[PDB]
Nucleic acid binder design. Structure first.
Length: 458
DNA sequence: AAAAAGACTGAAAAAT
DNA sequence: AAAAATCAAAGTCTTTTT
């Protein structure tokens, strides 16, 4: 269970489309052409992005072009058949202009809207869960627009539709006043599931996944998970030795399987690679993680740059960010990597008999609550802790120590670091927490800030 | 088993 | 005064369906 009482106001739907001004025009093959409202709206999306690289990608241009056409009238389809013939320049000029306008505004102008914004947030940015009011992270529904997929996402440029109340599922307690939908509408459904943490959800049309409206990080519901998250990592700390000794043993098994996971566990532990869940071949942008590494991403070097037994990792991880690395591994690991590449083709899984489910199942068996990602938290937290002891100058000046903080903070993000660690250091050294964590971080880390002392040790 | 369904960081805008 | 400086996709992991 996640709560007992949950009463909130529902989402803020996207502002309705504002038709272009008459003077603002669109040209096709030199000719002028007034676009159907729907076709117009979609075109503005593209127009506002002509100043962006997205518009230079062929995947984007095509995905946009096709989707735009599905919204055109029958005649528009007949005419507009070449993107290269469409002229969005004037539309583009307009929006840029509009943006300039908002920049060149009176303080009188600026303040009004600023207060306008405060009225929405005060009303729709909070909810009541149990005894207290809580802040909501994202209370507005994602506006329609063009999909900004990262990397070579095969769907970038696709049209994200406008979410109606009819697509919205509301969640709140049974005894709560149900938020009423916009006049003339209905929610998709209303449920009272005290097992989930979300207030609102809906299915996004581009990938068919479910989007949710949840609470601020400073939430008890959120905060509590984070607290639990670091605890789990602390527990790994104790069992890591036992764990490292076991997979270090599995490196010599008569079961490539036992060996496949062990090696992967190694990299994860040692290099902090991500689990690597399989992604839909042809529906997503190809990035990989540990378990999903392919033969082609690894290249072994018996000896290299004076280094002996080097593994040359070269692939695209999360967000299509390239991970290149030369890693001197332990012999049995290096060799095992040869065994794993034997008679395989590049386009093949390195860890053919392994997956995140399998791996995590094993980790769980080793310690309840242990999943791959825990190694990233654990590795990051411990490093900062130890680098803080080692680098903090015991007779320092508040600002330089903060440097020490950065230096310690170098070899190691607000996500993989038990905040209590920084909370401890700041007290022991009398460095105001305010000096490291800003208002919001203090908001978010209030729990670590209050339940940890100069004596804290991750 | 495994797929499918479900529940939890980048980058752009805003804050002399 | 003005200008220059400092939200939502994409993963992981769990639960349900097949």
């Amino acid at each position: 269970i996640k709560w007992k009482f949950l009463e909130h106001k529902g989402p803020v739907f996207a502002p309705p489309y504002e038709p272009l001004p008459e003077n603002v025009k669109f040209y096709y093959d030199g000719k002028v052409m007034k676009l159907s409202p729907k076709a117009e709206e979609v075109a503005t999306f593209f127009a506002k992005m002509l100043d962006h690289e997205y518009t230079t990608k062929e995947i984007f241009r095509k995905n946009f072009f096709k989707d735009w056409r599905k919204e055109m009238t029958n005649e528009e389809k007949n005419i507009i058949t070449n993107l290269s013939k469409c002229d969005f320049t004037q539309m583009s000029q307009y929006f840029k202009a509009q943006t300039e306008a908002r920049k060149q505004m009176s303080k009188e102008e600026k303040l009004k809207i600023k207060e306008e914004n405060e009225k929405l947030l005060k009303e729709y940015g909070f909810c009541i869960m149990d005894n207290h009011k809580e802040r909501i992270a994202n209370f507005k529904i994602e506006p329609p627009g063009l999909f900004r997929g990262r990397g070579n996402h095969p769907k970038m440029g696709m049209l994200k539709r406008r979410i109606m109340p009819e697509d919205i599922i509301i969640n709140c307690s049974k005894d709560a006043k149900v938020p009423s939908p916009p006049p003339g509408h209905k929610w998709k459904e209303v449920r009272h599931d005290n097992k989930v943490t979300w207030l609102v959800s809906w299915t996004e049309n581009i990938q068919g996944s479910i989007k949710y409206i949840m609470l601020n990080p400073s939430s008890r519901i959120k905060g509590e998970k984070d607290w639990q998250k670091y605890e789990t990592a602390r527990r790994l700390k104790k069992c890591v030795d036992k764990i490292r000794n076991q997979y270090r043993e599995d490196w010599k098994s008569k079961e490539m399987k036992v060996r496949q996971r062990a090696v992967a566990l190694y990299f994860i532990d040692k290099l902090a690679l991500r689990a690597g869940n399989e992604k839909e071949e042809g529906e997503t942008a190809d990035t990989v993680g540990c378990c999903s590494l392919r033969v082609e991403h690894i290249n072994l070097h018996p000896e290299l740059d004076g280094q002996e037994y080097v593994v040359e990792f070269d692939f695209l991880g999360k967000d299509s960010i390239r991970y290149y690395n030369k890693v001197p591994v332990e012999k049995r690991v290096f060799k095992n990597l040869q065994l794993f590449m034997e008679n395989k083709q590049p386009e093949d899984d390195l860890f053919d008999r392994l997956n995140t489910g399998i791996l995590n199942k094993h980790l769980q068996d080793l310690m309840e609550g242990l999943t791959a990602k825990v190694f990233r938290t654990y590795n990051a937290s411990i490093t900062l802790q130890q680098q803080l002891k080692e680098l903090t100058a015991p007779d320092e000046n508040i600002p330089a120590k903060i440097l020490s903080y950065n230096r310690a903070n170098r070899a190691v993000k607000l996500n993989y670091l038990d905040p209590r660690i920084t909370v401890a250091w700041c007290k022991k050294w009398g460095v105001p927490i305010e000096k490291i964590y800003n208002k919001t971080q203090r908001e978010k880390f209030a729990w670590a800030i209050d339940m940890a002392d100069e004596d804290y040790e991750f």
